Design an enzyme around this catalytic site. Structure first.
Site, PDB file in Angstrom:
ATOM      1  N   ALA A  27     -27.928  42.411  25.362  1.00 15.11           N
ATOM      2  CA  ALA A  27     -27.912  43.798  25.806  1.00 15.11           C
ATOM      3  C   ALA A  27     -28.598  44.719  24.821  1.00 15.11           C
ATOM      4  O   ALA A  27     -29.258  45.672  25.232  1.00 15.11           O
ATOM      5  N   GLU A  73       3.744  53.224  38.258  1.00 20.24           N
ATOM      6  CA  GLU A  73       4.505  54.384  37.823  1.00 20.24           C
ATOM      7  C   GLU A  73       3.696  55.294  36.916  1.00 20.24           C
ATOM      8  O   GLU A  73       3.823  56.507  37.023  1.00 20.24           O
ATOM      9  N   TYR A 121     -11.381  42.493  11.116  1.00 20.63           N
ATOM     10  CA  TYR A 121     -11.318  42.816  12.531  1.00 20.63           C
ATOM     11  C   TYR A 121     -10.253  42.031  13.272  1.00 20.63           C
ATOM     12  O   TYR A 121      -9.923  42.388  14.405  1.00 20.63           O
ATOM     13  N   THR A 164     -20.796  52.699  13.187  1.00 17.29           N
ATOM     14  CA  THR A 164     -21.699  51.627  12.806  1.00 17.29           C
ATOM     15  C   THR A 164     -22.978  51.586  13.630  1.00 17.29           C
ATOM     16  O   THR A 164     -23.646  50.553  13.654  1.00 17.29           O
ATOM     17  N   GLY A 208     -17.687  42.807  27.145  1.00 16.56           N
ATOM     18  CA  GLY A 208     -18.225  43.192  25.858  1.00 16.56           C
ATOM     19  C   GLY A 208     -17.785  42.278  24.728  1.00 16.56           C
ATOM     20  O   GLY A 208     -16.773  41.588  24.798  1.00 16.56           O
ATOM     21  N   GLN A 209     -18.569  42.299  23.652  1.00 14.83           N
ATOM     22  CA  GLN A 209     -18.261  41.505  22.471  1.00 14.83           C
ATOM     23  C   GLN A 209     -17.063  42.055  21.712  1.00 14.83           C
ATOM     24  O   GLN A 209     -16.431  41.324  20.948  1.00 14.83           O
TER      25      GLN A 209
END
Lengths: 49, 427, 41, 427, 440
Positions: free
Chosen positions: E99, E254, E224, E179, E10-11
């Site tokens: 996509a 674990e 971001y 968004t 994914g971007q």
């Protein structure tokens, strides 16, 4: 003199072939030279393009 | 004293031999005009300090020899060795067999005689050719037949470009290919083959190279031939003499057509990131992609497999990876060959050509397979010939230049016998 | 005597292979025989 | 002569074990390269109890250090005394349990225990008249308590006669460092009731008490805490390695101690313990360590002996000391009260005096008390086991490897008759 | 030799690994050229990089990661950036056609041309392993590749590999400020193909990291790049116990048995306690106890979910830096005996503590400071059933009038697949309510 020369050379050769730090040393050296040549030739073909 | 005499016939022959002899001249320290600022396997030596190859070049179209005679290798050869005809064979088996080659077969055989009297421990000849053309079929057939009935039981190895399924330049290519296979079925010790379409796909895929020329193929064939004949010049852990392939690969005297490939064909920009160990390259030999002749591998079972390793290689890595390959039971080996393989090792690593594209790799394998898969290629190469010969296309030139109508038929049956012989030794 | 032979082979071959070396080629400070430029690297 | 094989299991075991071998080796003059540099004549004769006899006057231990994960033994290949172990003895695996007692008992524990158990007989073959084993644990984990139970029963079936000690660190109940451990301590005690000839339990919560209130440390690392266990580990075996005017080896301190063969969970302690300043102000006599070996604050397990009576009591002493004064102060301890003391066994005291103290103190004492007030340590884990098991918390991890629903209830029924087997004698 | 295969998708996965792999080249001495520098290349006593980096014979280190998306413009800032020659170029898979924010476009239409290709580069990276500890998926519940193709990788990795750990890192769509508008059709349709084939999956909102940045890091208007440093610090702290030795070493295998009480309750939420701007680190002591008391806050979470309305099933506290474990165990007794921090009455033990020796590092330009010790809490509280009562209502309003469904049924999907994956979260909204109930 002949004794000197022959004995010295034989010693060197066989003792090198038999020890060992040398084995790792040689593999390292060969690999380094090879990859150096590789990078140089890559640069060469880039320049050619 | 493992001397071999190399004759290049056909344009495919001389244009392969250009790359082969530039590779052999850079293999040793020989500067290309002849001098030098172990090599007695391919070069005679004169006391001025000059080296002369053991090579005879021949075609019947003068321009492809004359570009060699003018170009940068003009001082390598004794310039009588570059044999040259007058009128082209014109893609005609009858003309290169019966009519045109009768002027030049005597000259090339006498220069073969003088080179074999220069030699002293003779082992074999390397005849480079194709299955496409008139002088690549007929003149090679006359050359092989006369050398068989003249020299004896010495290894006349031949190297063959092979006619691909959907890739050809001629139209009449099944005709002269089935004819040269018929008449050279008997007197060549072994015939290695390569497919130009498969080399095209490997050049597209492994080497990341788009639109390849013919030099980018002949470099690969030069690497193959040098990996075959490194054993005579440079000594190793397990050397393999050139006669050993005759008792090794071929089981019956019509099955002397093994395939080849060479596994670390890889460009610099990917081989800088990838290591290529012994187990990696010998597993990578057996993909359906990375072979060099188009036959579907999985439809055929293996007969024998002669690997040649070149460079730094420790024999236990080989002996473990061979059984690792063997136990999978999808790589079907025939149930009358439990031995399976035959392996050789040489110390000196593969070399590098200036103006090259294969990356310098420390170790490399060239494997010589003998598959059952090539029955499909012989089925299709009989079928195209059968399609044309239903209504006598292109036959009248060859019958005006020297065979009757029945000899194409007897070559058809004497080639179909081989396709029955695979089903015989398969079941 | 095997350590002296190892020093002889190092100081013969490894002089010009400066910019890179593999991992196990040098142990317990062998640079003193090639003192001149290996130290400043 | 009388020799001891040592076993170390789990990440807590190797941390305990690496600190343990220092306090044996520095006692016996051994340097980190393993060459004897001691001073006294009596130092060396009983080096065969723990150590082997290497060439050139070198000594190596007889421990095997089992661990599932290699990430703990790379610490002890670089430890201060981490060199002297034979590198064959390090046994390690690829897939860790991850605190799942089912995976540390079934899945990879069965795959690995062969590689340990061949080393087990190798250090047992060099023995002359083997006396027993030794093990280190912490019960809260799946890698040490999980492997340990399969490492106890597989050694019982081959050497069933030998006095097989096994340490244990029972989990801290106030705050636990694991959430899955009531399945893990309860599944391991059931295997620890049946097979081990001798066990000690160590509340590491009381180790946080014993450094805070008494020792007055500020920054107690686990490595400094494993010093405190290592005094007791060498404290019990001090008659097998040294002279004695009243001695007691391992076999004379088990069968003189245990009344019924399901009752071997003991509660130890160490008497001469002071801060570095406070050592000066406090005397070093014989009763002043009798003041502190029974002192409820200076105990090692968090089960106060005012919740019952002492069945039998032991104290091994170290150093040259008088034996009226160790007897009259052991006569007084039984006679100052009759409430915390058992009527139907008339005496309780075990006494042992060697002749060489640990270096740094003129006197020493190591306490062993077999109390009836350990039953609340089990009704505490019984209620924490049945809190999870009613709603079947976390159980979908333990089931998926070969454990069913019945394997908890029988390990709880046996865990719940242990309190009544304690409650009947307690009342 | 231990190993992880950090496979992104994914971007919003390539933009996480851009800030994730620059941290791991700084933990070790690795240059962006890949070769180790001169000081560390003569001794070679450190072999801590074998978890993530490979090693070629000519002395170059190539990481173990493959970058996947269908949008060719965020991989093409990696083949020209500072890290041009670090990554092997056969591990950056990239599709031409997009996509375009449809789940069904990224499960049935486009993603089938890359499901075979990325599963050959995965097979290279997992083939060098003596032992694989676990994968690390970085994806997003937003759009086509990060939510659709991730479900296609999960149904093909576990069929290929099986009982092998596969951790997962995932953003979660915000309560209010998101968004997209087709987004609740995806987050209900990607949980349903992850309820079976993922051993653990962490939960992060980008909205709660927008709240900690105006509050704790004292940064106004965060971009971001400053969201992928915080997530990149956690995935360092999870996997730091493989590489650098410790006092209580806790591996990846674990976790997955030590956090989940029932085998579809694998959604733990995480936090990173000592995030302090470099001004206030000069003012505040940061002990070991007071950064344990600062994970259970109503403000330092990462999912917008206040756990006062839920009971804590378990915790898994991982510590890093200079800590001593007398002082860890003093503080966990405070949090259990405090009245508000609710614990489920079938967990009287509760916790899981891990210790490591390396202090956290500092990336140049990072807003975080050099703090001597740092923790990372991991819990799967009962309170997360509140957040599905928000998203599953937002699926219901749109599906009542059948909004936006005509792109999905035309892009190779049947209309019934919304119905069965709506009834499937009609169980998980109840499955939390049966186990939060007190004992009968």
């Amino acid at each position: 003199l002949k004794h000197e020369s022959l004995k010295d050379k034989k010693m060197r050769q066989q003792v090198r072939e038999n020890s060992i730090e040398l084995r790792e040393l040689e593999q390292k050296l060969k690999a380094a030279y090879m990859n150096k040549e590789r990078a140089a030739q890559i640069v060469e073909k880039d320049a050619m393009k | 004293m493992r001397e071999c005499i190399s004759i290049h016939v056909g344009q495919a022959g001389v244009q392969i031999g250009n790359a082969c002899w530039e590779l052999y001249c850079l293999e040793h320290g020989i500067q290309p005009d002849g001098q030098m600022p172990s090599f007695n396997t391919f070069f005679s030596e004169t006391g001025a300090g000059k080296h002369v190859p053991r090579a005879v070049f021949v075609d019947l179209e003068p321009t492809v020899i004359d570009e060699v005679r003018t170009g940068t290798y003009r001082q390598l050869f004794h310039p009588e060795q570059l044999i040259t005809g007058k009128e082209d064979a014109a893609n005609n088996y009858a003309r290169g067999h019966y009519t045109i080659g009768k002027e030049i077969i005597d000259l090339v055989l006498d220069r073969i005689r003088k080179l074999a009297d220069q030699c002293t421990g003779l082992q074999g000849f390397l005849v480079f050719h194709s299955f496409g053309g008139g002088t690549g079929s007929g003149f090679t057939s006359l050359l092989m037949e006369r050398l068989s009935v003249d020299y004896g039981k010495k290894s006349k190895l031949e190297f063959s470009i092979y006619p691909a399924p959907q890739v050809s330049t001629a139209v009449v290519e099944p005709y002269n290919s089935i004819l040269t296979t018929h008449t050279t079925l008997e007197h060549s010790d072994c015939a290695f083959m390569v497919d130009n379409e498969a080399i095209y796909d490997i050049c597209r895929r492994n080497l990341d190279i788009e639109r390849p020329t013919y030099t980018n193929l002949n470099r690969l064939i030069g690497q193959i031939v040098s990996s075959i004949t490194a054993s005579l010049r440079f000594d190793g852990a397990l050397n393999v003499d050139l006669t050993e392939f005759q008792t090794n690969l071929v089981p019956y005297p019509r099955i002397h057509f093994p395939l080849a490939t060479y596994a670390p064909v890889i460009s610099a920009e990917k081989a800088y990131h990838e290591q290529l160990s012994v187990a990696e390259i010998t597993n990578a030999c057996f993909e359906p992609a990375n072979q060099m002749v188009k036959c579907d591998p999985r439809h055929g079972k293996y007969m024998a497999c002669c690997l040649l390793y070149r460079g730094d290689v420790v024999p236990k890595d080989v002996n473990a990876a061979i059984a690792t390959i063997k136990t999978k039971r999808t790589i079907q080996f025939v149930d009358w060959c439990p031995t399976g393989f035959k392996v050789g090792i040489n110390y000196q690593p593969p070399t590098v050509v200036p103006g090259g594209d294969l990356a310098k790799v420390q170790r490399a394998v060239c494997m010589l397979s003998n598959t059952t898969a090539i029955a499909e290629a012989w089925a299709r190469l009989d079928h195209k010939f059968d399609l044309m010969y239903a209504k006598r296309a292109f036959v009248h030139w060859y019958v005006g230049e020297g065979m009757e109508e029945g000899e194409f038929s007897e070559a058809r049956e004497d080639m179909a016998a081989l396709e029955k012989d695979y089903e015989e030794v398969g079941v | 005597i095997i350590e002296e032979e190892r020093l002889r082979l190092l100081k013969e071959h490894a002089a010009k292979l400066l910019g890179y070396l593999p991992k196990g080629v040098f142990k317990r400070e062998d640079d003193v025989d090639m003192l001149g430029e290996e130290f400043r690297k | 002569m009388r020799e001891i094989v040592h076993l170390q299991a789990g990440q807590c075991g190797n941390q305990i074990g690496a600190k343990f071998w220092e306090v044996i080796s520095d006692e016996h003059g051994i340097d980190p390269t393993g060459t004897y540099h001691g001073d006294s004549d009596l130092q060396l004769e009983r080096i065969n109890v723990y150590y082997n006899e290497a060439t050139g006057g070198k000594y190596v231990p007889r421990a095997v250090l089992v661990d599932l994960e290699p990430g703990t033994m790379d610490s002890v290949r670089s430890g201060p005394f981490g060199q002297i172990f034979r590198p064959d003895n390090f046994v390690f695996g690829q897939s860790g349990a991850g605190n799942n007692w089912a995976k540390g008992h079934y899945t990879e524990g069965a795959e690995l225990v062969d590689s340990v158990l061949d080393v087990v007989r190798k250090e047992a073959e060099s023995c002359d008249c083997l006396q027993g084993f030794q093990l280190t644990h912490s019960l809260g984990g799946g890698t040490g308590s999980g492997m340990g139970t399969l490492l106890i029963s597989k050694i019982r079936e081959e050497y069933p006669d030998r006095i097989m000690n096994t340490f244990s660190v029972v989990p801290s109940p106030k705050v636990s460092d694991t959430v899955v451990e009531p399945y893990n301590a309860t599944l391991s005690v059931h295997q620890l009731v049946e097979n081990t000839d001798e066990t000690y339990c160590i509340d590491n919560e009381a180790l946080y008490d014993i450094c805070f209130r008494t020792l007055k440390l500020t920054t107690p690392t686990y490595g400094d805490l494993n010093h405190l266990v290592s005094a007791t580990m060498s404290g019990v075996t001090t008659c097998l390695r040294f002279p004695g005017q009243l001695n007691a080896d391992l076999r004379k301190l088990a069968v003189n101690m245990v009344p019924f063969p399901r009752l071997h969970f003991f509660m130890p302690g160490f008497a001469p313990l002071t801060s570095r300043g406070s050592q000066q102000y406090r005397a070093l006599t014989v009763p002043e360590l009798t003041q502190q070996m029974f002192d409820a604050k200076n105990m090692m397990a968090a089960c106060d002996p005012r919740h019952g009576r002492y069945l039998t009591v032991a104290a091994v002493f170290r150093g040259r000391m008088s034996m009226k004064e160790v007897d009259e102060q052991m006569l007084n301890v039984q006679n100052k009260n009759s409430s915390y003391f058992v009527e139907w066994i008339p005496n309780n005291v075990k006494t042992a005096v060697c002749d060489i103290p640990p270096r740094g103190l003129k006197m020493s004492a190591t306490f062993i008390g077999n109390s009836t007030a350990i039953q609340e340590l089990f009704k505490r884990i019984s209620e924490q086991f049945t809190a999870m098991f009613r709603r079947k918390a976390f159980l979908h991890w333990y089931t998926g490897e070969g454990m069913d629903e019945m394997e908890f209830t029988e390990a709880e029924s046996n865990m719940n008759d242990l309190v009544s087997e304690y409650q009947q004698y307690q009342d």
